[PDB]
Design a protein around this nucleic acid. Structure first.
Ligand SMILES: [Mg+2]
Length: 276
DNA sequence: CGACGGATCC
DNA sequence: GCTGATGCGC
DNA sequence: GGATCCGTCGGGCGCATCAGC
C-alpha cells in the first residue's frame, strides 16, 4: 500500500505557532546526493536546521554548492578517520549554536563521525547515524554495546534543557514500522536486540517518538527503501529515521513529517515543526 | 533485504 | 588525470 | 489447497583503491 503524508500542522496544542523547522536526511553519499539535486529540495523545504547522515565525505571534499546556503551558514561536519567513504554526519543551522561537540564520549580517540551535539538557547539537538548490525548480523554485538553507550551519554545531556534527537537510528521499532516484519526479524534493523535497545532509549532518557506520538496507528509510513527490486515504487520500506523529544518538549510539538517524494538517496527527508 | 522455492497448517 | 574493475559496507 | 512460514539467493547503490595508460 502506498502512503501520503498528511498536511503540515504548524501550530502547537497550546495554539502557539511553529517557530522552528528541523530537517533530517540520510543522504547516502553527500556528493552523489548533491548531483541528484538533493540541495534543490532542501532549498524548497527551507529548514532552520538541517541534519545529514552518511555524508561519506571529508570536509575538504564538500561541494562548493554548500558554500551557497546563506540561510544555513553555520555548518558542522564530522567524518571518521581512516574510513572516510563511510559514515559522516553534518549539521547546518540558520542561527549559531551555543556549543557544538562530536561523538558520544571518546571521539578524540574513537573518531567515528556518527554523532553531533549542538546546544541552542532552549534545547539540545543531537543528530546520529547509528551503526548498522550488518549483513548476517556480524556487527550486532557492537551495535548493542554502542546502543548502551549512547543511551547513557544521552541521559547525561538531558540533565539540563530538553533534548531533540534526530537522524537515522537504524531500527524499525515495531512491526508497524516496516512493510515485512516477519521476514526481517533476523535482519539488521529489526532484530529483537535492536528493537529492545530503541525501547530502552525511550524509557531510560526518557524520550518520545514524535511521529508515532502524533500518528500512533498509521501504517505504511517509511523513511527507507532498498535500492534493490524497485522497493520504493512498491512502498516496501522501513521507518529508520526519527525525531525523538524530551517529554517537556511535547507541548512544543506541532508536527513530524515524512517527505516521501524527495528523491536523491535510499532514505527520504523527515521534518520537525516545533513552537519554541 | 525482497523475491522466491519449498515445507507446514487445517 | 581519467576510466572502470574490484572491494566493501549499506 | 490457499495462506503462512522459513531459509536461501542475487544484488542496487556510493565511494575508496588499484591498474593501466
Ligand atoms: Mg545507508
Amino acid at each position: 500500500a502506498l502512503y501520503e503524508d498528511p498536511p503540515d500542522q504548524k501550530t502547537s496544542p497550546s495554539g502557539k505557532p511553529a517557530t522552528l523547522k528541523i530537517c533530517s536526511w540520510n543522504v547516502d553519499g553527500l556528493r552523489a546526493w548533491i548531483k541528484k539535486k538533493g540541495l534543490d529540495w532542501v532549498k524548497e523545504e527551507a529548514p532552520d536546521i538541517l541534519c545529514l547522515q552518511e555524508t561519506k565525505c571529508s570536509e575538504n571534499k564538500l561541494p562548493a554548492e554548500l558554500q551557497e546556503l546563506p540561510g544555513l551558514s553555520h555548518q558542522y561536519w564530522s567524518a571518521p578517520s581512516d574510513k572516510e567513504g563511510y559514515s559522516g554526519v553534518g549539521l547546518l543551522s540558520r542561527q549559531c549554536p551555543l556549543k557544538v561537540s562530536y561523538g558520544i564520549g571518546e571521539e578524540e580517540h574513537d573518531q567515528e563521525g556518527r554523532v553531533i551535539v549542538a546546544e541552542f538557547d532552549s534545547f539540545v539537538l543531537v543528530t546520529a547515524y547509528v551503526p548498522n548490525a550488518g549483513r548476517g548480523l556480524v556487527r550486532l554485538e557492537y551495535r548493542q554495546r554502542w546502543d548502551e553507550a549512547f543511551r547513557k551519554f544521552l541521559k547525561g545531556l538531558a540533565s539540563r534543557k530538553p533534548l531533540v534527537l534526530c537522524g537515522d537510528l537504524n531500527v524499525a521499532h515495531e512491526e508497524i514500522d516496516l512493510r515485512n516484519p516477519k521476514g526481517n526479524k533476523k535482519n539488521a534493523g529489526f532484530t529483537p536486540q535492536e528493537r529492545q535497545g530503541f525501547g530502552e532509549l525511550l524509557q531510560a532518557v526518557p524520550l518520545a517518538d514524535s511521529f508515532r506520538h502524533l500518528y500512533p496507528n498509521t501504517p505504511y509510513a517509511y523513511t527507507f527503501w532498498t535500492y534493490m527490486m524497485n522497493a520504493r515504487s512498491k512502498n516496501v520500506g522501513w521507518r529508520l529515521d526519527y525525531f525523538l523529544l524530551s517529554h517537556s518538549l511535547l507541548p512544543a510539538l506541532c508536527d513530524s513529517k515524512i517527505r516521501s517524494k524527495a528523491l536523491g538517496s535510499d532514505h527520504c527527508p523527515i521534518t520537525l515543526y516545533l513552537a519554541l
